[PDB]
Design a protein around this nucleic acid. Structure first.
Ligand SMILES: Nc1ncnc2c1ncn2[C@@H]1O[C@H](COP(=O)(O)OP(=O)(O)OP(=O)(O)O)[C@@H](O)[C@H]1O
Ligand SMILES: [Ca+2]
Ligand SMILES: [Ca+2]
Ligand SMILES: [Ca+2]
Ligand SMILES: [Ca+2]
Ligand SMILES: [Ca+2]
Length: 901
DNA sequence: TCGTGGAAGCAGTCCGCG
DNA sequence: GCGGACTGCTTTC
């Protein structure tokens, strides 16, 4: 096999590298890597190295890395550019792996671990590490085993061994329901004392040294805790054995308000699953507890126990250990679904970076672009300092608030990346400027043509047309990967809908799910077999299709994010190729494209309808348009349609055969006007939306910018078995809105769009009547809580104190003098509830950590004093009043003359 | 919330508005 | 009560 790196570090003048050799063995080597950097030289001097602008460079070979670093400083002192890759380990990987890396995940040791620490005096601070570590479960991907290190004797209790037999039993038999599929993979080791536990853990770690290290909050909790605990007991030299090169560094992580410490383990790549999840999942959750996320992702019930976690070991050590094991497995289950480790390895090896650098799109792109340019003997520019400056972004049309019955949407495929490719926007392709007219003059095609030589953006920039820039070239490669995976995602999605249809008529039989590849549209033969399957087999096939869809979503959406991040990186001052001329060239061209095509679509439709000045485009945001299709439906007449699916077919065909060709002609003209390098503005139909045929549903509504709801029958070619709501911006989509309120508001919207005013009124009346029965957590608002200290004046709210912060201060007064009461953590999320006048908490609201029950100390009082009237008014009635007034609809029946009978 | 970008909505504070 | 200026938070692209 081809060799591939596992990890790489610079330690002084050595590169330390762990790698898989040509026989598939893990190896480690220290290399006295001599880096090269570059300086501009005279033309007369012959060379093969040129900067991205075509100016010649001399290569300077250094005796070691420290000499290279010192040279960069002196070049700054002198006032001259020091060119080349200044992150020497990236240069080392470029030299050592000068080919497309093919990696084999089965040879990469992925470790997933979790620790337990009993603490009677509140949260066990990792920087102090003053309490024993009393359990570690460490899953190893190469062994496929859960290694359980269990402390039997501690100053907080002596306990009996954990029983695998009880662990396996049902909760109803008094067991822990440790899943049967992992029971045989558990390797259980009990210890008489903590010192032996940890010494054995370190020996184990040396034998089975993680390459990728993950878990839940491992970077902020488990890793620093283990390191500092070992450090306190044995000294630093022993704690440093967690690094395969015996080197660690406390790293200070700064943000706007405050900072925290982590431990950098040289030669390990830590990918904390909480951070993977936050970056790659595209959710926003009200809580990031593993229990909460596990329930959300896997539909597994929360891990239940009696009493506080600080007494769980002593009261029920059996359950304590089982829950530590299950916690590790839950993360593995999330990853089996979401495949974020796979994504990380893919992108890391593609860019040739430390795998943990996948968290930084700037680092990722710097490496991709460096490797690309190096292949052509080109030399990257030095990074420079820039002051942060604001710059303009997208255009958003102000919609007229209203119901909108029939709607077709269209938007550009990978808009900003396509603009980069079309215009040829790159650091080295800048050809000059032209005199800009107002944007409006380009939109209406009255401005002078910018150039007859170069490719232009309406911000005044011109670009070469003779050759692609490195940014277009590399962005295209990832775009093509993205497109492949999106294809698999949409096929799986379409396949899912076939199974849902078939589930209407399941067969009374015993059979098996079909062995198929859900990434490809089902053949006719597969469709026929599906129609004969049992509900059991169908449901298993649906689950598998949906997992295939998720896998495709992860792969495509994060490649989309990476390429969009490159457009964004051009406006980040730390990026080697930062240039507001290029970032603004993209955004300003986008504003033009949207408004240009709005004008073309209105012109086209006014022509087919034989009108003038009518607005068919009702909305658009960045790269999208929403087109009213009422007149198109009315030209055929609603009476002529057999069913909903018939007019959906008709609109689909109209979009594909009339609108899209008009749109494409419109954009081809714009390409020629701007003299661009290649026409790549592809604006495909997204959604077909409307009410069910013959219903009194309104189909859709907008309340304002970034706030609308649509009843969609077809999305990017997926014809749904049941209509799906596309809701953007409304309270149903916000993590701050109470869970039960999201649900009720969504049902109000479904009724408005599908059934009509009367249905909406029936549901409102019932929700208003019953909502006081809802569980307090389900009707709590949610908010992130920053700057708690700034607004804390002797335990009471200071000037301008935010409502949620006030709630936290109320909570803190109510639990004062309790070391064991859950503390609200700066920067994390809280549930918030309003309190009625004259309550014992002495204020109008209270807040507590999200994803948790409020401590029993005060729960009963909170329940008694909860202000249901305020909660209803604020979170449900106010937003619903906004929806219905926009839609010209009443949520309460107005009186009429018929009342007099 | 360490980690690409800008646009823009709503809640709530403070306080004006005769 | 409603809005503007401002902060805080959140979402949509
Ligand atoms: N997370 C982001 N970071 C930077 N720019 C973004 C981000 N999300 C969207 N944009 C910008 O807005 C444009 C339009 O967004 P949109 O969500 O339609 O994605 P897209 O790139 O056009 O991909 P698709 O092909 O899925 O429509 C993007 O091309 C860019
Ligand atoms: Ca735990
Ligand atoms: Ca798009
Ligand atoms: Ca059937
Ligand atoms: Ca869009
Ligand atoms: Ca599309």
């Amino acid at each position: 096999m081809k060799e591939f790196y596992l990890t790489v570090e610079q330690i002084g003048d050595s590169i330390f590298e762990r790698y898989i050799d040509s026989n598939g063995r893990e190896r480690t080597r220290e290399v006295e890597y001599k880096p090269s950097l570059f300086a501009h030289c005279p033309e007369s001097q012959a060379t093969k190295y040129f900067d991205i602008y075509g100016k010649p460079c001399t290569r300077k070979l250094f005796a070691n890395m420290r000499d290279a670093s010192q040279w960069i400083k002196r070049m700054e002192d002198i006032g001259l550019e020091a060119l080349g890759m200044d992150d020497f380990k990236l240069a080392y990987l470029s030299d050592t792996y000068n080919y497309e890396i093919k990696y084999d995940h089965t040879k990469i040791r992925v470790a997933n671990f979790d620790i337990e620490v009993t603490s009677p005096d509140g949260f066990p601070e990792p920087s102090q590490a003053k309490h024993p570590i009393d359990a570690i479960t460490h899953y190893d991907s190469i062994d496929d085993r859960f290694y359980v290190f269990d402390l039997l004797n501690s100053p907080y209790g002596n306990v009996e061994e954990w029983s695998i037999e009880i662990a396996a039993k049902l909760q109803e038999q008094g067991g822990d329901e440790v899943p049967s599929e992992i029971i045989d993979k558990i390797i259980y080791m009990p210890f008489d004392n903590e010192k032996e536990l940890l010494m054995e853990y370190l020996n184990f770690w040396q034998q089975k040294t993680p390459v990728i290290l993950t878990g839940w909050n491992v970077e902020s909790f488990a890793i620093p805790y283990v390191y500092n605990r070992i450090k306190n007991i044995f000294g630093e030299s022993t704690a440093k054995r967690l690094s395969p090169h015996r080197k660690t560094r406390v790293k200070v992580i700064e943000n706007m308000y405050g900072s925290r410490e982590i431990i950098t383990l040289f030669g390990i790549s830590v990918l904390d699953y909480i951070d993977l999840y936050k970056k790659f999942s595209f959710t926003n959750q009200p809580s990031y507890s593993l229990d909460y996320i596990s329930e959300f992702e896997l539909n597994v019930g929360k891990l239940k126990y009696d009493g506080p976690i600080s007494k769980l070991r002593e009261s029920n050590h059996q359950r304590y250990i089982s829950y530590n094991i299950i916690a590790v497995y839950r993360v593995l289950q999330i990853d089996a679904k979401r495949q974020f480790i796979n994504l990380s390895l893919d992108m890391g090896y593609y860019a040739k970076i430390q795998i943990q650098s996948v968290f930084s799109p700037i680092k990722t792109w710097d490496a991709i672009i460096f490797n690309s340019l190096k292949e052509q003997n080109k030399v990257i520019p030095q990074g420079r300092s820039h002051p942060v400056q604001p710059y303009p972004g997208a255009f958003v049309k102000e919609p007229i608030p209203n119901r909108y019955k029939y709607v077709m949407s269209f938007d550009l495929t990978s808009a900003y990346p396509s603009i980069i490719r079309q215009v040829n926007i790159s650091p080295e392709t800048i050809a000059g400027t032209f005199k800009v007219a107002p944007l409006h003059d380009y939109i209406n095609a009255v401005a002078e043509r910018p150039s007859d030589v170069y490719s232009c953006s309406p911000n005044g920039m011109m670009y070469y047309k003779d050759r692609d820039g490195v940014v277009p070239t590399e962005i295209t490669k990832v775009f093509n990967q993205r497109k492949e995976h999106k294809g698999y995602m949409l096929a799986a999605q379409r396949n899912g809908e076939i199974i849902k249809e078939a589930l209407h008529n399941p067969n009374l039989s015993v059979d098996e799910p079909l062995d198929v590849d859900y990434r490809f549209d089902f053949s006719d033969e597969i469709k026929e077999k599906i129609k004969k399957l049992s509900a059991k087999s169908l449901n298993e096939m649906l689950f598998r299709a949906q997992r295939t869809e998720v896998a495709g979503m992860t792969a495509q959406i994060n490649r989309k994010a990476l390429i969009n991040g490159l457009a964004g990186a051009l406006g980040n001052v730390w990026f080697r190729y930062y240039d507001l001329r290029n970032a603004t060239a993209i955004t300003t061209f986008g504003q033009m494209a949207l408004q240009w095509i709005e004008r073309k679509v209105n012109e086209y439709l006014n022509e087919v309808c034989g009108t003038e000045g009518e607005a068919f485009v009702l909305y658009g945001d960045t790269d999208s348009i929403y087109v009213s299709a009422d007149k198109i439906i009315d030209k055929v007449g609603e009476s002529k349609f057999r069913d909903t699916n018939h007019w959906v077919d008709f609109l689909d065909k109209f979009a594909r055969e009339r609108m899209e060709p008009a749109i494409d002609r419109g954009f081809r003209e714009m390409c020629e006007y701007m003299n661009n390098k290649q026409h790549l503005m592809f604006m495909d139909r997204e959604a077909i939306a409307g009410p069910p045929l013959g219903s009194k549903g309104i189909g859709g509504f907008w309340t304002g910018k970034k706030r609308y709801a649509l009843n969609v029958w077809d999305m990017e070619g997926t014809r749904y078995a049941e209509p799906k709501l596309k809701i953007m911006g409304l309270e149903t989509q916000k993590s701050s809105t109470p869970k039960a309120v999201q649900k009720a508001l969504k049902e109000c919207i479904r009724r408005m769009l599908q059934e009509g005013e009367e249905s909406l009124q029936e549901y409102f009346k019932e929700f208003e009547k019953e909502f006081r029965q809802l569980n307090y957590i389900s009707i709590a608002s949610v908010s992130s809580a920053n700057n708690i200290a700034k607004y804390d004046v002797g335990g009471f709210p200071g000037p301008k104190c935010p409502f949620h912060i006030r709630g936290i201060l109320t909570y803190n007064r109510a639990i004062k003098g309790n070391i064991d009461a859950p503390q609200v953590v700066e920067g994390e999320k809280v549930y918030v509830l309003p309190l009625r006048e004259g309550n014992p908490f002495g204020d109008k609201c209270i807040a507590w950590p999200s994803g948790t029950e409020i401590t029993d100390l005060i729960k009963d009082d909170v329940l008694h004093w909860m202000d249901y009237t305020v909660l209803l008014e604020k979170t449900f009635i106010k937003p619903l009043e906004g929806f219905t007034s926009a839609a010209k609809l009443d949520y309460e029946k107005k009186a009429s003359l018929f009342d007099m009978f």
